[PDB]
Design an enzyme around this catalytic site. Structure first.
Site, mmCIF file in Angstrom:
data_model
loop_
_atom_site.group_PDB
_atom_site.id
_atom_site.type_symbol
_atom_site.label_atom_id
_atom_site.label_comp_id
_atom_site.label_asym_id
_atom_site.label_seq_id
_atom_site.Cartn_x
_atom_site.Cartn_y
_atom_site.Cartn_z
ATOM 1 N NE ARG A 4 50.856 57.737 41.053
ATOM 2 C CZ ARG A 4 51.813 56.804 41.398
ATOM 3 N NH1 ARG A 4 52.841 56.225 40.536
ATOM 4 N NH2 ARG A 4 52.260 56.660 42.922
ATOM 5 C CD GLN B 12 66.675 49.113 42.735
ATOM 6 O OE1 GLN B 12 65.288 49.064 43.162
ATOM 7 N NE2 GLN B 12 66.992 49.793 41.858
ATOM 8 N NE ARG C 7 51.318 67.455 42.566
ATOM 9 C CZ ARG C 7 51.793 68.276 41.680
ATOM 10 N NH1 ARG C 7 52.822 67.709 40.816
ATOM 11 N NH2 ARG C 7 51.673 69.613 41.722
ATOM 12 C CG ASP D 191 59.823 59.600 32.730
ATOM 13 O OD1 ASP D 191 60.280 59.256 33.999
ATOM 14 O OD2 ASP D 191 58.546 60.222 32.616
ATOM 15 N NE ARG D 192 62.905 57.447 38.252
ATOM 16 C CZ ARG D 192 62.569 58.148 39.392
ATOM 17 N NH1 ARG D 192 61.232 58.476 39.342
ATOM 18 N NH2 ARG D 192 63.371 58.424 40.313
ATOM 19 C CE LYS E 189 59.606 60.272 36.937
ATOM 20 N NZ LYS E 189 58.609 60.200 38.132
ATOM 21 C CB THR E 190 55.289 60.377 33.902
ATOM 22 O OG1 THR E 190 56.119 59.587 34.164
ATOM 23 C CG2 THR E 190 54.921 59.887 32.173
ATOM 24 N N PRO F 179 61.921 61.749 43.271
ATOM 25 C CG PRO F 179 61.010 62.452 44.901
ATOM 26 C CD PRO F 179 62.257 62.614 44.318
ATOM 27 C CG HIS F 180 58.064 56.985 44.252
ATOM 28 N ND1 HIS F 180 59.480 57.179 44.889
ATOM 29 C CD2 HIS F 180 57.462 56.217 45.134
ATOM 30 C CE1 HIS F 180 59.289 56.695 46.036
ATOM 31 N NE2 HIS F 180 58.185 56.063 46.401
ATOM 32 C CE1 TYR G 150 56.387 51.106 46.374
ATOM 33 C CE2 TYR G 150 57.202 50.300 44.208
ATOM 34 C CZ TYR G 150 56.983 51.325 45.082
ATOM 35 O OH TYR G 150 57.504 52.697 45.090
ATOM 36 C CD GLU H 216 58.828 55.946 35.021
ATOM 37 O OE1 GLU H 216 57.764 55.558 34.663
ATOM 38 O OE2 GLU H 216 59.317 55.963 35.741
ATOM 39 N NE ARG I 170 52.411 53.859 37.454
ATOM 40 C CZ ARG I 170 52.207 55.332 36.968
ATOM 41 N NH1 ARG I 170 52.894 56.205 37.385
ATOM 42 N NH2 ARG I 170 50.981 55.777 36.499
ATOM 43 C CG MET J 117 57.267 65.642 43.005
ATOM 44 S SD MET J 117 59.291 65.718 43.819
ATOM 45 C CE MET J 117 60.301 65.405 41.989
ATOM 46 C CD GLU K 272 53.771 52.716 43.148
ATOM 47 O OE1 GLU K 272 54.496 53.142 42.347
ATOM 48 O OE2 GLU K 272 52.812 53.315 43.833
HETATM 49 N N1 LIG Z 1 51.067 69.966 38.600
HETATM 50 C C1 LIG Z 1 50.273 68.901 39.362
HETATM 51 N N2 LIG Z 1 48.824 69.423 39.821
HETATM 52 C C2 LIG Z 1 48.175 68.415 40.298
HETATM 53 N N3 LIG Z 1 48.221 67.152 40.333
HETATM 54 C C3 LIG Z 1 49.323 67.033 39.694
HETATM 55 C C4 LIG Z 1 50.395 67.547 39.096
HETATM 56 N N4 LIG Z 1 51.392 67.069 38.504
HETATM 57 C C5 LIG Z 1 51.266 65.805 38.741
HETATM 58 N N5 LIG Z 1 50.183 65.547 39.146
HETATM 59 C C6 LIG Z 1 49.340 64.171 39.641
HETATM 60 O O1 LIG Z 1 50.089 63.605 40.790
HETATM 61 C C7 LIG Z 1 50.691 62.133 40.469
HETATM 62 C C8 LIG Z 1 51.951 62.143 40.156
HETATM 63 O O2 LIG Z 1 52.277 62.673 38.770
HETATM 64 P P1 LIG Z 1 53.132 61.626 37.567
HETATM 65 O O3 LIG Z 1 53.294 62.521 36.585
HETATM 66 O O4 LIG Z 1 51.850 60.861 37.245
HETATM 67 O O5 LIG Z 1 54.062 60.769 38.401
HETATM 68 P P2 LIG Z 1 55.408 61.325 38.392
HETATM 69 O O6 LIG Z 1 56.022 62.262 39.125
HETATM 70 O O7 LIG Z 1 55.791 60.024 39.439
HETATM 71 O O8 LIG Z 1 56.191 60.588 37.296
HETATM 72 C C9 LIG Z 1 49.869 61.862 39.089
HETATM 73 O O9 LIG Z 1 48.549 61.262 39.505
HETATM 74 C C10 LIG Z 1 49.488 63.066 38.506
HETATM 75 O O10 LIG Z 1 48.286 63.024 37.532
HETATM 76 O O1 LIG Z 2 65.101 52.200 40.657
HETATM 77 C C1 LIG Z 2 63.833 52.176 40.474
HETATM 78 N N1 LIG Z 2 63.230 51.516 41.639
HETATM 79 C C2 LIG Z 2 62.026 51.537 41.975
HETATM 80 O O2 LIG Z 2 61.746 51.209 43.114
HETATM 81 N N2 LIG Z 2 61.209 52.212 41.259
HETATM 82 C C3 LIG Z 2 59.583 52.073 41.428
HETATM 83 C C4 LIG Z 2 59.040 53.358 42.096
HETATM 84 C C5 LIG Z 2 57.724 53.545 41.455
HETATM 85 O O3 LIG Z 2 56.700 52.244 41.918
HETATM 86 C C6 LIG Z 2 57.745 53.164 39.975
HETATM 87 C C7 LIG Z 2 58.523 54.244 39.033
HETATM 88 O O4 LIG Z 2 57.291 54.761 38.684
HETATM 89 P P1 LIG Z 2 57.324 56.729 38.565
HETATM 90 O O5 LIG Z 2 58.766 57.138 38.366
HETATM 91 O O6 LIG Z 2 56.392 57.081 37.567
HETATM 92 O O7 LIG Z 2 56.724 57.194 40.039
HETATM 93 O O8 LIG Z 2 59.108 52.077 40.009
HETATM 94 C C8 LIG Z 2 61.698 52.996 40.063
HETATM 95 C C9 LIG Z 2 63.033 53.155 39.963
HETATM 96 I I1 LIG Z 2 63.804 54.027 38.190
#
Ligand SMILES: Nc1ncnc2c1ncn2[C@@H]1O[C@H](COP(=O)(O)OP(=O)(O)O)[C@@H](O)[C@H]1O
Ligand SMILES: O=c1[nH]c(=O)n([C@H]2C[C@H](O)[C@@H](COP(=O)(O)O)O2)cc1I
Ligand SMILES: Nc1ncnc2c1ncn2[C@@H]1O[C@H](COP(=O)(O)OP(=O)(O)O)[C@@H](O)[C@H]1O
Ligand SMILES: O=c1[nH]c(=O)n([C@H]2C[C@H](O)[C@@H](COP(=O)(O)O)O2)cc1I
Lengths: 313, 313
Positions: free
Chosen positions: B172, B80, B168, B114-115, B17-18, B12-13, B56, B38, B174, B15, B177
């Site tokens: 931040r 989608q 988390r 990334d995804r 990840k990036t 999920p978004h 959104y 992405e 989007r 977490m 979003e």
């Molecule tokens: N290990 C961590 N500790 C603290 N904050 C984190 C950690 N990893 C990510 N974050 C923060 O939480 C949010 C989600 O991370 P992000 O990498 O930006 O998104 P995503 O997981 O959706 O790809 C961001 O604001 C990021 O800076």
């Molecule tokens: O199939 C999808 N559907 C969707 O709604 N998102 C949204 C979720 C979030 O707002 C953003 C993706 O950003 P992050 O993966 O970095 O959280 O796009 C992404 C995908 I891939």
């Protein structure tokens, strides 16, 4: 080792098609022939309600200026998604049984399909692209999706002069369908650019080596669907399509490149048409089936389909 | 013979990840690592305008009762389509270079993505299905489309307690979003039912032999996504799903069955997270590449992608 012949009858709407299928399977031929109809029940009911309706309605509503193109675009697109789903899920459960093209011996089974996936996944989406109702980008997502072309994909297209074809269309009208000459003339153009890009590609044609001819029977890049994508929205400032779009033309290629097109002259009487179709059959490709028990399954599958979704037969 | 390791980081978004990808490629590791972001630029610009926005927005508009579900459904669906296109066309041009799974020797190339496609083609479509914004039927068209799972498909999912995860997400936001806890909690449920059906299937689980349990770590049919499809609209009068829908669950199966899931505990500090990711890497699957010249192409491809569509790095 056995072979199973698959024939994919297509081309635009209202061109003797469904008429000549039920006249071909009417010959009393043993049950070695399995005819699968259009998934219409999915369409009208189980998929969405009167999907056909929306397509043709959303058009009038568009043409009569009652929605933004982007409005017709979005409905027109789910219209398509919902149209094709049933062609796809089938093709998914049929793929794991398709072995190689054993050339053209007799097939122990022969499937005659009413329309093949790219009708709902490339052709019509492309026609609406020309009808101002579909977006170039959306068109190419369906393109980027067209499942890998299986072996033995014999696609039967059609031929009938615009005039006599129009006359035919105006002798039967679908459930919640309107009569559109542009949408007609449109489709007839996709069904040509398509059955043309095959020939062209088959003859060593490369869209990339030929691109700059577009900029400004042996067909050129200009007779291919590849033309339709030389639209503003897909071209970067350098004039080259962006690679997102670029790669997808490559995808599209690899799908069409491997198809077996034939074109039946629908200009005759129903019987003779089917005779011709029957003759085209001969030179078509047949394929082995991976699992020895595949054939029966490939039977039930299509038989179950036509049971659940054939408002035709 | 060479191998190339592909890692598909998902979940999920919001977490980590990036964050943890750019911290993993920051190690100064030689250019044997190719990180692909992405396709956001497709999203925001070249695909449609602010696609993220619509998703959104159309939700608020839905939740605040300003459109019929069927209205949110149709936009939500093209949302989608347009979201996934870029994951697909890539996977299309990457497939013809992927040879078998040579187990787990060192890979001459390592792609960190990334995804992975099923994020945009199964997961989110499924979340919106639960969010009242997506239709069961539309959900299963994407299901019926999910391209054939290639060898060496190592998908890295995630773990973070709801609370810390929420916190988390709220640190931040989007481009265009909004913050949605339900849509959050929703996705977290798809990312579980999914990374659960793998385990289950891998252990000889058959959805059909298990169906009647639904009627009324070793997981059951009840812990699989297969539950989500026991919706009224897909069940015939006999209570059995129609075969249209039936076959597509089979398709879905064959796709997930062959995936390599791993789950990284995002509960740590960014650095350590990437260390862990780095360690998960070890036991991942690597694959040979059909054409000897494939690797470089698989490099340019992803490098070109990230050049044209990475608003991240
Ligand atoms: N290990 C961590 N500790 C603290 N904050 C984190 C950690 N990893 C990510 N974050 C923060 O939480 C949010 C989600 O991370 P992000 O990498 O930006 O998104 P995503 O997981 O959706 O790809 C961001 O604001 C990021 O800076
Ligand atoms: O199939 C999808 N559907 C969707 O709604 N998102 C949204 C979720 C979030 O707002 C953003 C993706 O950003 P992050 O993966 O970095 O959280 O796009 C992404 C995908 I891939
Ligand atoms: N060979 C033919 N001669 C005269 N009329 C025909 C012939 N084939 C089809 N038609 C008629 O023209 C229309 C288009 O044919 P049909 O089989 O119904 O549709 P489609 O080609 O779209 O599948 C129908 O009304 C049909 O009865
Ligand atoms: O992808 C498609 N898009 C479309 O608009 N139709 C319309 C055209 C016609 O109104 C009807 C199909 O009926 P016939 O093929 O029998 O003409 O559905 C069909 C398909 I497949």
């Amino acid at each position: 080792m056995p072979t199973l012949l698959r024939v994919y009858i297509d081309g635009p709407h209202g061109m003797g098609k469904t008429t000549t299928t039920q006249l071909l399977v009417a010959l009393g031929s043993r049950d070695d022939i399995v005819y699968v109809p259009e998934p219409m029940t999915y369409w009208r009911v189980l998929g969405a309600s009167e999907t056909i309706a929306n397509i043709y309605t959303t058009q009038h509503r568009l043409d009569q200026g009652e929605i933004s193109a982007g409005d017709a675009a979005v409905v027109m697109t789910s219209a398509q998604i919902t149209m094709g789903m049933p062609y796809a899920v089938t093709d998914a459960v049929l793929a794991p049984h398709i072995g190689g093209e054993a050339g053209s011996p007799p097939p122990a089974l022969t499937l005659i399909f009413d329309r093949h996936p790219i009708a709902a996944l490339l052709c019509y989406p492309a026609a609406r692209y020309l009808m101002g109702s579909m977006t170039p980008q959306a068109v190419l997502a369906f393109v980027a999706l067209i499942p890998p072309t299986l072996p033995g994909t014999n696609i039967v297209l059609g031929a009938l002069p615009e005039d006599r074809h129009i006359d035919r269309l105006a002798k039967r009208q679908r459930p919640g369908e309107r009569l559109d000459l542009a949408m007609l003339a449109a489709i007839r153009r996709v069904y040509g650019l398509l059955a043309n890009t095959v020939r062209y590609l088959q003859c060593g044609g490369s869209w990339r080596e030929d691109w700059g001819q577009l900029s400004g029977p042996r067909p050129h890049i200009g007779d291919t669907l590849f033309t339709l994508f030389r639209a503003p929205e897909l071209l970067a400032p350098n004039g080259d399509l962006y690679n997102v779009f670029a790669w997808a033309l490559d995808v599209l290629a690899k799908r069409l490149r491997s198809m077996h097109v034939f074109i039946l002259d629908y200009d005759q009487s129903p019987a003779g048409c089917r005779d011709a179709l029957l003759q085209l059959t001969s030179g078509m490709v047949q394929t082995h089936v991976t699992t020895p028990g595949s054939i029966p399954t490939i039977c039930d599958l299509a038989r179950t389909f036509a049971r659940e979704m054939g408002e035709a037969n």
